[PDB]
Design a protein around this ligand. Sequence first.
Ligand SMILES: OC[C@H]1O[C@@H](O[C@@H]2[C@@H](O)[C@H](O[C@H]3[C@H](O)[C@@H](O)[C@H](O)O[C@@H]3CO)O[C@H](CO)[C@H]2O)[C@H](O)[C@@H](O)[C@@H]1O
Ligand SMILES: OC[C@H]1O[C@@H](O[C@@H]2[C@@H](O)[C@H](O[C@H]3[C@H](O)[C@@H](O)[C@H](O)O[C@@H]3CO)O[C@H](CO)[C@H]2O)[C@H](O)[C@@H](O)[C@@H]1O
Ligand SMILES: OC[C@H]1O[C@@H](O[C@@H]2[C@@H](O)[C@H](O[C@H]3[C@H](O)[C@@H](O)[C@H](O)O[C@@H]3CO)O[C@H](CO)[C@H]2O)[C@H](O)[C@@H](O)[C@@H]1O
Ligand SMILES: [Cl-]
Ligand SMILES: [Cl-]
Ligand SMILES: [Cl-]
Ligand SMILES: [Cl-]
Ligand SMILES: [Cl-]
Ligand SMILES: [Cl-]
Ligand SMILES: [Cl-]
Ligand SMILES: [Cl-]
Ligand SMILES: [Cl-]
Ligand SMILES: [Cl-]
Ligand SMILES: [Cl-]
Ligand SMILES: [Cl-]
Ligand SMILES: [Mg+2]
Ligand SMILES: [Mg+2]
Ligand SMILES: [Mg+2]
Ligand SMILES: [Mg+2]
Ligand SMILES: [Mg+2]
Ligand code: NA
Lengths: 335, 336, 337
Amino acid sequence: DWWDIPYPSQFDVKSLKTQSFISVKGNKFIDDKGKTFTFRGVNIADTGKLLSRNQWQKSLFEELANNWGVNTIRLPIHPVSWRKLGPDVYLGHIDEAVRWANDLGIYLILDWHSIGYLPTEQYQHPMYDTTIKETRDFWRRITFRYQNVPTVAVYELFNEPTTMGNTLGERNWAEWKTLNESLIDMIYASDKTVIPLVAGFNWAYDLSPIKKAPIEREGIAYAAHPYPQKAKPEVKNDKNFFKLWDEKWGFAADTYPVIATQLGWVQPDGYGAHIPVKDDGSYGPRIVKYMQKKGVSYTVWVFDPDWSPTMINDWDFTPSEQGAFFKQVMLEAKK
Amino acid sequence: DWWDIPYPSQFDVKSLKTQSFISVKGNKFIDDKGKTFTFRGVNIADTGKLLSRNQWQKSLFEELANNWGVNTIRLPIHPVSWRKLGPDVYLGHIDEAVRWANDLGIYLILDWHSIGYLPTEQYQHPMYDTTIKETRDFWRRITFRYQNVPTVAVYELFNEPTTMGNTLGERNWAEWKTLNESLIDMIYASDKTVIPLVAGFNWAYDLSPIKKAPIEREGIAYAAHPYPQKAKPEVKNDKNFFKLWDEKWGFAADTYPVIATQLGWVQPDGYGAHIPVKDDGSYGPRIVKYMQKKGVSYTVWVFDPDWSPTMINDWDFTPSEQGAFFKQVMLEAKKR
Amino acid sequence: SNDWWDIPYPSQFDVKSLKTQSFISVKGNKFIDDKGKTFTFRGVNIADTGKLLSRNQWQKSLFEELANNWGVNTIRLPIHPVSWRKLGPDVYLGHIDEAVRWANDLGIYLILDWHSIGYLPTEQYQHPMYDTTIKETRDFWRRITFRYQNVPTVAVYELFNEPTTMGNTLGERNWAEWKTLNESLIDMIYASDKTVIPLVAGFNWAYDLSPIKKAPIEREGIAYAAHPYPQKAKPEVKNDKNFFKLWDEKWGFAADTYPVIATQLGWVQPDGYGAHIPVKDDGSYGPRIVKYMQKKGVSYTVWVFDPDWSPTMINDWDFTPSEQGAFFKQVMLEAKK
Ligand SMILES: OC[C@H]1O[C@@H](O[C@@H]2[C@@H](O)[C@H](O[C@H]3[C@H](O)[C@@H](O)[C@H](O)O[C@@H]3CO)O[C@H](CO)[C@H]2O)[C@H](O)[C@@H](O)[C@@H]1O
Ligand SMILES: OC[C@H]1O[C@@H](O[C@@H]2[C@@H](O)[C@H](O[C@H]3[C@H](O)[C@@H](O)[C@H](O)O[C@@H]3CO)O[C@H](CO)[C@H]2O)[C@H](O)[C@@H](O)[C@@H]1O
Ligand SMILES: OC[C@H]1O[C@@H](O[C@@H]2[C@@H](O)[C@H](O[C@H]3[C@H](O)[C@@H](O)[C@H](O)O[C@@H]3CO)O[C@H](CO)[C@H]2O)[C@H](O)[C@@H](O)[C@@H]1O
Ligand SMILES: [Cl-]
Ligand SMILES: [Cl-]
Ligand SMILES: [Cl-]
Ligand SMILES: [Cl-]
Ligand SMILES: [Cl-]
Ligand SMILES: [Cl-]
Ligand SMILES: [Cl-]
Ligand SMILES: [Cl-]
Ligand SMILES: [Cl-]
Ligand SMILES: [Cl-]
Ligand SMILES: [Cl-]
Ligand SMILES: [Cl-]
Ligand SMILES: [Mg+2]
Ligand SMILES: [Mg+2]
Ligand SMILES: [Mg+2]
Ligand SMILES: [Mg+2]
Ligand SMILES: [Mg+2]
Ligand code: NA
């Protein structure tokens, strides 16, 4: 009977090992000793995708933490999967990830993984389909459940804002800013320790609206998705890419913390190659140097052998080209 | 086939015996002879809950009208139940209630029983989940079906507005006022005889925004849900409670009619007792004294043996502590 | 797969499968073809695709009968939201593809009509068969516009059949709100295919265009809809002058400035099959509305070429004409010559 459906519960914080909260201070993330912190890690696939082939298991997190140098895993929660498993079940699996990550001393970014224009509720593909109501309810449920959990560090409100050339609606920063502020307010009402992560347009590439109209809330960070072909100089060299990246997103790191929550590449004739992820490989060192110099955090897309661009070519973790490259970067940074 | 689905029908007003319309005049409800009317009664449970145990029957209304002194029953229509039964079936059951109530000379308050913040479509619990679209459609359908029906006196638009400490959204009176005004316009386009009942924030406790920004429509009343622990005076007496009640909701009764559409208590150590309904029993006399001196209408929550605070222990109507108290209040008021 | 991550991205209609057929465009108050010649849409509604499928009447032979024997150059498809949901987008679009091929084979054009009745801003409607949301409406037009990019056969996107608040029982009718919402739909459509013709309707069931004099839709290439059923205008004395004047006041004036399509019109006898206000008439309306539209150069699609939905143009699927059917058949055959 519907009147017997129970009220929800909160994650048991006493079940966790000691782990520092991460906080925002100025343009930096800091730990609870005030030391500058950067998120460095990978995306994995949606929980439901992983479960379907029995790959949702602690051993995945152990591989990443022990052999790939990560301190962070981004979970791209697809709305269609949230519905298919159902909130109750999906949250039970996120609980597993919290325990696994906490045991390894690594952090999670929870990403509401839609692509499109939330104010008109139009999207790139049905797997990303959602509504304002459902998006708010997702964040309400997450915020309540993971109150006071240091492991869950960042709430990435809406993966990739885009109107696809205004075919989805009229992109309007004021409208999107207001909606983000509304989501932030629901979260902060419930847990002030979490870091909301806000994205710009052009699939989370273009932060330039914040130069004059930044989100008017404290404690937030900005996302950036600097895939190789987002910037399109004729002469492909460091100086030209840096000029273009500076203008569209890199400038943000001067004032706010930035997480490049997707980045990566595959050869133009490789597996799952498509605009804007095609590159000859020179992008790898370029984006890493750029982020290193600016102190930008990152999670590579994607530690999965099916979804592209892949970091691994099979579930024995055989590295792809970009996987081998980023593996060494992250291991060296962990050292 | 969908193109053969019929258009809706209106309730047959000739099926009813004579019963006065209730109307709003200034700060009072009145009947069709101008006599001041006070709604005094109870909530019963959602229709679907009652049907599930075969307790949706005229006998329930007879018990209340004959033995408990009520002149009003409030029906808390839960959105999840509206969906589960479906509109067509649920309306057929409301039609039964209308006939039963009319035959007994009592009135109905129809309550769209949600708890949360309709402008952001976020709620306390999924049983209350709704949308602006579904809420409008509920009122559209009700207004059409029950046109010119005196028995159905009050349309209580949204039971308990709350943002749960702004976890559901940012409470904003202007926005809420505007949405109620939109709903009222839909209703009044269809039936100007009905009384809309509008609620404030803090679970329909706080009407204070209306001091400066009242709903800009005539013929409405305001809800109040003055549970015992809503007001929290350090020193618990008539003076301090009356002052706090005055400030947040009682003042409204100076200017508009007010229905306390939920009130009641359970002893603090009682099975199932919770904030804000815990009380040592002194609230009963105090809230009744306050309401009586201000001429405030009321429907006790709840005449059900399961849903708390209960007025009865079982379906033989054994009164609970608050049940026994309010029964004697209502029987005495009916004789006055 | 039954796996959601394997669901393909959508595809566009194969424009190479089509015979040559001119695009129709808007220029001033006229429709024109690709030679610059003034074009007039003249044809009929048929029923919703799902209704027709249910009895195996969604057939090429229906389009052939109309094009070959009834003088039409246009068919309007009234896509009901409940049917969109019942068949599902993917399947419904596959059936629209059939219509595109049929119409192109015959050299005739389609008007695609998102066939709801009510007030989209509040998402409240006349009947559940018309029920929709802003989200679903936008998505319909997004999908349609993508699929039929660069397809001349598909000429007009009729955004929302019949705006009405039913005496403000559905919401407060408000031109500014409605204008803005139509502009929003147009922007999404134009971002995907600038060649299409959006068709915008006013209140009172797509009858009152008068608000456009000072508050027209602020986009180029727009046509306006009117549904001038016989009892919409109510002159005290029934004669040509009084009907023409009332028609010009509420909608016909629009044709002086913009192209207009009367996407529903027609009548039945007051004691006839399915008779109801506002479609009852003794027949004098037929010559009147045709004379008026021909003077103004107004395009039209009669409601409806179906034996079940009323007012009918035919009594059976052998195409035996009803009173209005025979009348309009003669008019359209003469106009085609
Ligand atoms: O079935 C089609 C195709 O799917 C490919 O995997 C997809 C990923 O490439 C895709 O990654 C994108 C992110 O979701 C976006 O946020 C970002 O804009 O772009 C990323 C790179 O495209 O994710 C989806 C799931 O969201 C995957 O389905 C397969 O690799 C490929 O084999 C297959 O043909
Ligand atoms: O299943 C949990 C619990 O349900 C209890 O019954 C509930 C009622 O107590 C509850 O009453 C509330 C009103 O609906 C609200 O408007 C008001 O704010 O607060 C009232 C409580 O003080 O109603 C719900 C249905 O809406 C009932 O489920 C049972 O009493 C209890 O035994 C059971 O464990
Ligand atoms: O089942 C009831 C009744 O349905 C009739 O068919 C309906 C059509 O008459 C109706 O046409 C209307 C248009 O849809 C509207 O846009 C316009 O305002 O009014 C038209 C009528 O004047 O369409 C619906 C589908 O939308 C049909 O169901 C049958 O003709 C009748 O026999 C039957 O009893
Ligand atoms: Cl519970
Ligand atoms: Cl576990
Ligand atoms: Cl964009
Ligand atoms: Cl803040
Ligand atoms: Cl009876
Ligand atoms: Cl509140
Ligand atoms: Cl406020
Ligand atoms: Cl008024
Ligand atoms: Cl109207
Ligand atoms: Cl207006
Ligand atoms: Cl334009
Ligand atoms: Cl009629
Ligand atoms: Mg946390
Ligand atoms: Mg484009
Ligand atoms: Mg009434
Ligand atoms: Mg008894
Ligand atoms: Mg076209
Ligand atoms: Na579009």
